[PDB]
Amino acid sequence: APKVGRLIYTAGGYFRQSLSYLEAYNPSDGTWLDLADLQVPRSGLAGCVVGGLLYAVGGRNNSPDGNTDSSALDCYNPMTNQWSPCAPMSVPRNRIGVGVIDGHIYAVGGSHGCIHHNSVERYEPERDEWHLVAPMLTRRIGVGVAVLNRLLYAVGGFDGTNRLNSAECYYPERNEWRMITAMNTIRSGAGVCVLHNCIYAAGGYDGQDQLNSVERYDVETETWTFVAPMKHRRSALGITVHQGRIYVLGGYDGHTFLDSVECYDPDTDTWSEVTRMTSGRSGVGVAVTLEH
Amino acid sequence: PKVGRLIYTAGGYFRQSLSYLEAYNPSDGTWLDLADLQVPRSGLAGCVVGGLLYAVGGRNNSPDGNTDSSALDCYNPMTNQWSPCAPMSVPRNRIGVGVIDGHIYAVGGSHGCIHHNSVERYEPERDEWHLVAPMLTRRIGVGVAVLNRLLYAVGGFDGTNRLNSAECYYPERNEWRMITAMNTIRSGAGVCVLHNCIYAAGGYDGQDQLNSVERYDVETETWTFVAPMKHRRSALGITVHQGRIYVLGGYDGHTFLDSVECYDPDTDTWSEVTRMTSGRSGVGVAVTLEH
Ligand SMILES: O=C(O)[C@H]1CCCC[C@H]1C(=O)N1CCc2ccccc2[C@H]1CN1C(=O)c2ccccc2C1=O
Ligand code: NA
């Protein structure tokens, strides 16, 4: 009983300045929707869907006349096509990673000016409150976050001095972090998601170049393995999964800003370009309408 | 009375950091296309000392990468050539500068996350930078004016909030003192001196771009609004030529302005006198000195 009419949202991003675009792609018919724009333009933000509502978390408003790190949590309702402000986070978080467990949004890492966060906080939609949980073992900005077996995985990033290939796993019931096996490649701003019980890490920045390589983590073998690489090299990419296929949206390749949207098929182990965004951008917040 | 003075505009930003050097003559209304900067940059500040234009600080903002500048480059109008001078101790994007007794003061600015309260002074004869007493507040996007041999730092951004505050530097004592705060919060506003009053035109208050203009009389210690500009503009270049303020370019929230307005203090009115060859923001502006 698969759900029909699910939409891959893309919120915010950067192209010469921070963007406020909210657009929705339908993978079935291949159409794009031009939805209500963000109140404040934002890049380096993260997107997630909880209970039929899209959330935009953290980021930064990069403009020609100054920069401002965001602690904002804004909620988009598809029925009304309207953004509504929620309770803001305890601290601003640019280049943030987020994950959802038991209907609560986890805000992981990110930066506030010079402060590279290892702190993590949890949002409860029912009472509109943020609360700090156990902090990470490593400071991480540009961190990719994945949820698997009711555990939160923080993958890659940048601690302020070193660019990270390491990763750690959070345990909500115990409230503690534990380091897992490090990746084969150093990655900051990589697209991290979960597909068929494996944590993927696509693209990112290794300190030298933007990456097109993709590797997945099998939790039982505790081993990172390379799969088919993407066509285009990209960091700060939006990522998500829809009906057994990973979708990577936009990004930055060291020179241009990508409008390309590649689609990974795990059965054949091949990437294919399915569509293009209305304009090239990086640092977007991406999510999908939930299954059921 | 010197004639043939030129309003220079160096650097700027449109899509990426620019390396334009153009000069406007207010007398005949002509534009000159002079030698380009060796490295493109925006958020810089321009000043003239002894017949030589200087380009201080800034930021090479491009799609390939972003790099804050600690560079001092000197333009000679006789040779139409840029020459590199001794660099500053630290990079300073969105810098403010003022000249006192032939020395260039580099005030505030940013180096990535770091918002400077530090100030350093350049000696053209020795080609040396030296740190003086730091400001009481960290300021980026600060406007600098020089009146009665005192340097005034007006407005800006301290890393958390945009500022309406201002402070005055005393070169002989080497210390800063807070003056009366502005009526409006301003970052990236055009600050200059005219008829013994420190003007503060436009800017960015965090929410919107401003068209309002207010001036500070040093004796009354009071900020007072004057006639506002036609266009709302932040990150604008500003200068004074024969008793009239000239604001060049800027950013209005949507477009990058090519407009150049001119303020007449006798009538308290602005008027569009010319257009730049292309719209831009974060330009370094200065004028040929008067006798
Ligand atoms: O995040 C920021 O501070 C600002 C800095 C100014 C540009 C926007 C943004 C930024 O740099 N991002 C996007 C968000 C994001 C999110 C996660 C990881 C990395 C990033 C990097 C990716 N990236 C670059 O490194 C870069 C360098 C130069 C131009 C454009 C870019 C670019 O798009
Ligand atoms: Na903006």
Side-chain angles (χ1 to χ4, degrees):
Chain A
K3 182 170 175 178
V4 83
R6 298 169 66 190
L7 299 167
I8 294 167
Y9 296 94
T10 175
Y14 181 90
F15 178 61
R16 306 199 276 244
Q17 53 180 122
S18 289
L19 307 171
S20 63
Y21 306 133
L22 179 65
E23 291 172 307
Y25 176 63
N26 189 346
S28 298
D29 60 13
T31 57
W32 280 94
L33 305 182
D34 188 5
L35 308 177
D37 293 333
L38 289 161
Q39 304 260 233
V40 181
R42 280 190 280 171
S43 58
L45 76 164
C48 66
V49 175
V50 185
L53 297 174
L54 178 72
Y55 289 86
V57 196
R60 160 180 279 202
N61 184 27
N62 218 77
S63 58
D65 56 358
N67 304 329
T68 312
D69 293 314
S70 183
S71 64
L73 177 67
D74 296 297
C75 178
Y76 175 74
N77 187 358
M79 294 295 201
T80 61
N81 191 39
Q82 183 179 225
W83 286 94
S84 294
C86 307
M89 294 176 295
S90 60
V91 70
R93 296 180 184 276
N94 183 34
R95 296 141 102 147
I96 197 176
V98 302
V100 176
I101 311 180
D102 198 35
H104 298 158
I105 305 168
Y106 286 78
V108 182
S111 58
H112 176 220
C114 246
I115 299 162
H116 291 60
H117 300 302
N118 64 341
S119 59
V120 179
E121 47 190 312
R122 176 173 62 200
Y123 180 72
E124 294 183 50
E126 295 215 57
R127 23 178 47 256
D128 191 30
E129 288 186 343
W130 284 94
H131 289 294
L132 287 161
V133 296
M136 289 185 293
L137 303 171
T138 318
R139 295 172 178 283
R140 299 180 187 270
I141 83 170
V143 70
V145 176
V147 175
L148 177 53
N149 299 315
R150 305 164 61 182
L151 302 176
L152 201 92
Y153 292 85
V155 181
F158 177 73
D159 66 5
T161 319
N162 304 302
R163 203 150 275 105
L164 306 167
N165 67 335
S166 65
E168 48 186 304
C169 176
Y170 177 67
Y171 295 82
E173 299 293 314
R174 279 172 263 252
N175 192 29
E176 58 177 313
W177 292 81
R178 286 193 264 186
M179 296 298 301
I180 65 165
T181 313
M183 294 181 291
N184 299 318
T185 310
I186 293 163
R187 298 180 189 274
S188 65
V192 173
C193 69
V194 69
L195 173 64
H196 300 323
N197 211 70
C198 292
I199 301 163
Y200 284 73
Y205 186 64
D206 68 351
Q208 307 287 62
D209 305 316
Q210 284 72 29
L211 302 163
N212 61 349
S213 61
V214 183
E215 57 186 311
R216 56 155 176 251
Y217 181 74
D218 191 318
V219 294
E220 289 298 329
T221 69
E222 301 173 18
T223 306
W224 288 91
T225 307
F226 287 108
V227 305
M230 295 175 291
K231 178 63 264 194
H232 308 278
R233 300 176 165 277
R234 55 180 86 204
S235 62
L237 58 138
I239 193 169
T240 194
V241 175
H242 174 268
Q243 300 187 170
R245 282 176 164 78
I246 302 170
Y247 288 86
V248 303
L249 290 79
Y252 173 69
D253 70 348
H255 178 60
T256 71
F257 297 85
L258 303 178
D259 60 345
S260 180
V261 183
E262 301 183 49
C263 183
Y264 179 69
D265 182 33
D267 295 355
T268 55
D269 188 28
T270 51
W271 290 86
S272 58
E273 186 162 314
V274 288
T275 187
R276 323 210 92 187
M277 299 165 86
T278 55
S279 55
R281 65 195 80 164
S282 66
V284 295
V286 173
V288 282
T289 308
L290 294 171
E291 227 300 323
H292 263 310
Chain B
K2 191 169 183 175
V3 71
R5 298 171 64 185
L6 298 169
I7 295 165
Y8 295 95
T9 172
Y13 177 90
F14 179 66
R15 296 168 175 169
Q16 59 181 36
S17 288
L18 308 168
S19 60
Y20 302 131
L21 178 64
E22 296 175 309
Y24 175 68
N25 191 335
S27 301
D28 57 37
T30 58
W31 280 94
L32 269 39
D33 190 358
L34 308 175
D36 293 358
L37 288 158
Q38 281 299 317
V39 184
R41 41 168 161 178
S42 59
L44 78 165
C47 66
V48 175
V49 184
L52 297 172
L53 175 65
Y54 288 86
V56 198
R59 171 186 184 79
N60 189 4
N61 201 319
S62 63
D64 296 311
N66 304 326
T67 311
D68 295 315
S69 182
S70 66
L72 179 67
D73 294 305
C74 175
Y75 175 78
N76 190 349
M78 302 301 287
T79 66
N80 192 35
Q81 183 179 222
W82 286 95
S83 296
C85 305
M88 293 177 293
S89 60
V90 70
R92 294 177 189 276
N93 176 45
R94 299 177 191 283
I95 196 175
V97 301
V99 180
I100 295 161
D101 197 35
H103 300 140
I104 309 171
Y105 287 76
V107 182
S110 67
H111 179 216
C113 91
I114 306 172
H115 293 65
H116 303 305
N117 64 330
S118 59
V119 179
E120 49 187 306
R121 181 180 61 202
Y122 180 72
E123 298 187 52
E125 295 189 36
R126 299 175 67 80
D127 192 32
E128 286 185 323
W129 285 95
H130 287 119
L131 283 161
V132 301
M135 286 186 293
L136 302 171
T137 318
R138 297 179 175 284
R139 295 181 189 271
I140 83 168
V142 68
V144 173
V146 174
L147 179 50
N148 297 314
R149 303 163 64 178
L150 302 176
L151 195 150
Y152 294 84
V154 181
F157 180 67
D158 70 346
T160 320
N161 306 302
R162 275 80 192 180
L163 306 166
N164 70 322
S165 61
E167 49 184 306
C168 180
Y169 179 67
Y170 295 82
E172 298 293 324
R173 298 172 171 85
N174 192 25
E175 66 181 48
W176 291 82
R177 299 286 264 264
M178 298 295 297
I179 61 160
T180 311
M182 291 183 291
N183 301 316
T184 310
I185 294 160
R186 297 180 192 271
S187 179
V191 173
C192 66
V193 183
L194 178 59
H195 300 332
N196 211 66
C197 290
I198 303 171
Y199 283 72
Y204 171 61
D205 68 350
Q207 288 285 133
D208 308 314
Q209 289 74 23
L210 304 162
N211 62 342
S212 61
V213 184
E214 59 186 311
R215 68 191 178 188
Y216 181 74
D217 191 310
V218 296
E219 289 296 331
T220 66
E221 309 186 348
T222 304
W223 289 89
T224 306
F225 287 105
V226 299
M229 297 178 291
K230 172 76 261 180
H231 298 261
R232 298 176 166 284
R233 54 179 84 208
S234 61
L236 62 141
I238 196 170
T239 189
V240 181
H241 175 264
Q242 298 185 349
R244 284 183 161 81
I245 308 181
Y246 288 81
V247 298
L248 295 85
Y251 177 69
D252 70 352
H254 318 86
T255 55
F256 298 84
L257 304 177
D258 64 335
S259 179
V260 180
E261 298 181 49
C262 186
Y263 180 70
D264 182 30
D266 295 3
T267 58
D268 189 28
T269 51
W270 293 82
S271 61
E272 184 158 314
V273 296
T274 189
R275 274 164 135 79
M276 304 177 87
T277 52
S278 58
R280 60 192 80 165
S281 66
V283 297
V285 177
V287 279
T288 305
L289 294 174
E290 185 59 277
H291 293 302

